Amino acid sequence: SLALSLTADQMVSALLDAEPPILYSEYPFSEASMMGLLTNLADRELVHMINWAKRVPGFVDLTLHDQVHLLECAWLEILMIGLVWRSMEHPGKLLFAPNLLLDRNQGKCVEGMVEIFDMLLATSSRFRMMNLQGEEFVCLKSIILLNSGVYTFKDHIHRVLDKITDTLIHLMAKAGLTLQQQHQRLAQLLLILSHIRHMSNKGMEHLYSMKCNVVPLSDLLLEMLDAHR
Amino acid sequence: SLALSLTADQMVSALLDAEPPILYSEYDPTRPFSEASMMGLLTNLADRELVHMINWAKRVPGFVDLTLHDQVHLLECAWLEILMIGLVWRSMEHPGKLLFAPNLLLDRNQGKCVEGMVEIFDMLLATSSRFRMMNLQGEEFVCLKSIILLNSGVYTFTLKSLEEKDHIHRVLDKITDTLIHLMAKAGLTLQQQHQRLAQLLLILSHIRHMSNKGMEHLYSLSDLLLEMLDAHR
Amino acid sequence: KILHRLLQD
Amino acid sequence: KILHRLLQD
Numbered sequence: 001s002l003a004l005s006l007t008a009d010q011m012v013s014a015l016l017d018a019e020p021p022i023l024y025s026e027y028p029f030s031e032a033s034m035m036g037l038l039t040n041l042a043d044r045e046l047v048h049m050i051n052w053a054k055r056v057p058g059f060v061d062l063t064l065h066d067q068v069h070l071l072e073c074a075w076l077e078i079l080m081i082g083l084v085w086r087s088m089e090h091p092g093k094l095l096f097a098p099n100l101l102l103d104r105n106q107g108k109c110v111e112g113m114v115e116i117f118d119m120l121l122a123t124s125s126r127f128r129m130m131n132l133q134g135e136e137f138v139c140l141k142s143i144i145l146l147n148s149g150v151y152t153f154k155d156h157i158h159r160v161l162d163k164i165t166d167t168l169i170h171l172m173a174k175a176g177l178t179l180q181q182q183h184q185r186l187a188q189l190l191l192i193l194s195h196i197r198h199m200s201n202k203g204m205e206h207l208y209s210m211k212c213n214v215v216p217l218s219d220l221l222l223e224m225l226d227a228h229r
Numbered sequence: 230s231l232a233l234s235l236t237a238d239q240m241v242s243a244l245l246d247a248e249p250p251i252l253y254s255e256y257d258p259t260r261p262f263s264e265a266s267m268m269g270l271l272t273n274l275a276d277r278e279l280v281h282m283i284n285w286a287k288r289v290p291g292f293v294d295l296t297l298h299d300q301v302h303l304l305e306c307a308w309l310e311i312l313m314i315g316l317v318w319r320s321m322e323h324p325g326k327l328l329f330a331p332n333l334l335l336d337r338n339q340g341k342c343v344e345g346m347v348e349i350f351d352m353l354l355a356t357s358s359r360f361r362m363m364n365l366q367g368e369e370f371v372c373l374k375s376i377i378l379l380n381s382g383v384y385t386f387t388l389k390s391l392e393e394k395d396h397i398h399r400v401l402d403k404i405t406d407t408l409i410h411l412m413a414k415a416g417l418t419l420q421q422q423h424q425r426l427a428q429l430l431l432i433l434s435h436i437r438h439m440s441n442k443g444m445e446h447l448y449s450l451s452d453l454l455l456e457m458l459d460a461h462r
Numbered sequence: 463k464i465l466h467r468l469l470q471d
Numbered sequence: 472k473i474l475h476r477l478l479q480d
C-alpha cells in the first residue's frame with residue numbers, strides 16, 4: 001500500500017488536500033424546517049465525504065465491501081467532528097454552515113436534539129481550549145474513518161492507523177511540545193474520539209427512530225441509517 | 230491532592246491493590262437454559278459486580294476529590310463500559326469464549342439465546358482477541374479501566390465547578406504518563422510507545438460503542454441496575 | 463439514589 | 472446500494 005511509504009509531511013498535505021468544501025444551507029425554525037435543513041445539508045455533505053474517503057491514504061486499498069462498512073459505521077461521527085471543527089471560532093454556537101449558525105435554543109424545536117447539541121458545543125469548546133490545529137483535525141477525522149468499524153468486520157488498517165499516530169506526534173514535535181506534552185496531548189485528543197462515538201450513537205438512535213416520518217429522508221441517508229438499525 | 234503527587238509506580242500499585250475480585254455466577258450446568266435464565270444470570274452477576282465497582286471507584290486516585298454529584302454521574306455513564314472491559318480482560322486466555330465468571334464461560338452460539346446479544350458478543354470477542362494479540366498487561370488494563378471511569382462522563386456534566394473538569398483532566402494526564410512509563414519499562418521504543426498508547430485508547434472508542442449498543446438493548450432488573458439504566462434515558 | 467447512598471457509606 | 476455506486480464513481 002502506497003500509504004505506508006508516505007512521509008509524515010506527505011501524509012498531512014495529502015489529508016489537507018483531500019479536505020471537502022464547506023457547504024451552504026438552503027437560502028425562525030420549526031421542527032420540520034430544522035430537520036429539513038439539516039437532512040438536506042448532511043445529504044450533500046455525504047457525497048463529498050465519500051470522495052474525501054477515497055483520498056484518505058490506505059482507504060483505496062480496501063475491498064469495496066470494507067469501504068462500505070467503514071463509511072456506514074463512521075459517517076455521523078465524521079459529520080460531527082467536521083461540525084465541531086468549524087464551530088470552534090464560534091463559542092456557544094454550532095456552525096452547521098456559514099449561513100446556518102445555531103445555538104442550543106434552536107436545538108429545542110427538535111425533540112432530543114438539545115442534549116446532543118450540548119455535547120457538540122462541549123466538544124467544540126474542548127477543541128478550542130486545546131487549540132486544535134487543522135493538521136491535527138484532519139488526522140483525527142481520518143482515524144475515525146479507519147477505526148470506527150475496524151472491529152465490526154485488518155492488519156493493513158492497523159498499520160495505517162499507526163502511520164497516522166506517527167503523523168500526529170510528528171506535528172506535535174514540530175509544534176515544539178516536549179515528550180511528556182506529546183504523549184499527553186495524543187491521549188487527550190484520542191479520548192475525545194470516545195465522546196464523538198458516544199454522540200454518534202445517541203444521534204443515530206434518534207435518526208433511525210425519526211425515520212419512524214417527519215421528513216422523507218433520501219434513499220442514501222436511509223441506507224446509511226439502515227446500516228445501524 | 231494525593232493523586233497528583235503519585236509517582237507512576239505508586240499509581241500502578243494503588244490501581245492493582247484496588248482491583249475487585251472475580252465473582253461467581255449462579256450457573257447450573259445441569260439446567261437447560263433460556264433467554265430468561267441466562268439474562269437472570271448475567272443480571273444477577275452484574276448487580277453484585279456493581280457493588281464492588283462502586284467501592285473500587287473510591288480507590289481510583291482522584292475520584293474521591295470529586296463531589297458526590299460528579300462521582301454519581303461518572304459511574305452512571307461508565308458502569309457498563311467498565312463491566313465490559315473487565316469481561317474482555319478475563320476472557321483474553323479463552324479464545325472464542327467470554328468468561329463472565331469462572332463458572333460461566335460462554336460462546337457466541339449461547340449468546341443467540343438472547344435476541345440481539347450475539348452481535349454484541351462478537352464485538353466483545355473481537356476486543357478480547359485484540360487485547361490478546363497486543364498482549365495487554367495487567368498494569369495497562371488497570372490504567373485503561375480507570376481512564377474509562379474518569380473520561381466517559383467528563384463531557385456530560387456553576388463555572389467554578391469547571392475546576393472539577395480540570396482536576397479530572399490532570400488525573401487523566403497522570404494515567405497517560407503512567408501508561409508510557411510502563412511501556413518504556415517494557416523495552417518499547419518511543420515510536421512504539423506512542424503507537425501502543427494510541428492503539429489502546431482507540432479501543433476505548435469501541436468499548437463506548439459496545440456499551441451504547443448494550444444500554445440500548447438493556448432499557449428495551451435489580452433496583453441498582455434499574456437506577457443505573459434509567460440514567461441513560 | 464442507591465448509587466449515591468453506597469458512594470456515601 | 473447507492474454507496475456501492477458512489478464509491479466506484
Ligand SMILES: O=S(=O)(Oc1cccc(Br)c1)[C@@H]1C[C@@H]2O[C@H]1C(c1ccc(O)cc1)=C2c1ccc(O)cc1
Pocket residue numbers: 035038039040041042045079080082083096110111112113116117199200202203204206207210221
Ligand atoms: O446527533 S443528532 O442531533 O441526530 C439527530 C437527528 C435528528 C434529530 C435528532 Br433529535 C437527532 C445530529 C448531529 C447534528 O444534528 C443532527 C444532524 C443531522 C444529521 C443528519 C440528518 O439527516 C439530520 C440531522 C447533525 C448534523 C451534523 C453535522 C452536519 O454536517 C450535518 C448535520
Ligand SMILES: O=S(=O)(Oc1cccc(Br)c1)[C@@H]1C[C@@H]2O[C@H]1C(c1ccc(O)cc1)=C2c1ccc(O)cc1
Pocket residue numbers: 268271272273274275278312313315316329343344345346349350439440442443444446447454
Ligand atoms: O452488551 S450486552 O449484551 O447488553 C445486553 C443486555 C441485555 C440484553 C441484550 Br440483547 C444486550 C451486555 C454485555 C454482557 O452481555 C450483556 C451483559 C449484561 C449486563 C447486565 C445485565 O443486566 C444483563 C446482561 C453483559 C455483561 C458483561 C460483563 C459483566 O461483568 C456482566 C455482564
